[PDB]
Amino acid sequence: GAMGIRNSDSVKPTQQARPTVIRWSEGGKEVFISGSFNNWSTKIPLIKSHNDFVAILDLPEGEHQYKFFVDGQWVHDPSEPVVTSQLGTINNLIHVKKSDFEVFD
């Protein structure tokens, strides 16, 4: 039952906080991402590539949580690390390293 679907946008400036990119593999039509990096407020749309889905967020440096959203359903990636919430729900964990510091360009 495909009625109607929309999309959003996002800015990708250049600063110390290196951007966090995440790849998704499954073969879905609409994929999103949400974690502690966005206060789990809304679901950011995963930029669909020629190979698979990918999303480039803007994180500082350290450790942040996140979760995939496909077909209005929660799913985890076997290639990426998964965690366990207090509600026995499987989640995803992502880490960011200060590359802007070590790298000059």
UniProtKB/Swiss-Prot annotation:
It comes from the Eukaryota. The lineage of its organism: Eukaryota, Metazoa, Chordata, Craniata, Vertebrata. The modification Phosphothreonine is found at residue 89. The gene is Prkab2. The modification Phosphoserine is found at residues 10, 36, 49, 99. Disulfide bonds: none annotated. The chain holds residues 67 to 163 of 271 of the full protein. AMPK is a heterotrimer of an alpha catalytic subunit (PRKAA1 or PRKAA2), a beta (PRKAB1 or PRKAB2) and a gamma non-catalytic subunits (PRKAG1, PRKAG2 or PRKAG3). Non-catalytic subunit of AMP-activated protein kinase (AMPK), an energy sensor protein kinase that plays a key role in regulating cellular energy metabolism. In response to reduction of intracellular ATP levels, AMPK activates energy-producing pathways and inhibits energy-consuming processes: inhibits protein, carbohydrate and lipid biosynthesis, as well as cell growth and proliferation. AMPK acts via direct phosphorylation of metabolic enzymes, and by longer-term effects via phosphorylation of transcription regulators. Phosphorylated when associated with the catalytic subunit (PRKAA1 or PRKAA2). Phosphorylated by ULK1 and ULK2; leading to negatively regulate AMPK activity and suggesting the existence of a regulatory feedback loop between ULK1, ULK2 and AMPK. This is 5'-AMP-activated protein kinase subunit beta-2. Belongs to the 5'-AMP-activated protein kinase beta subunit family.
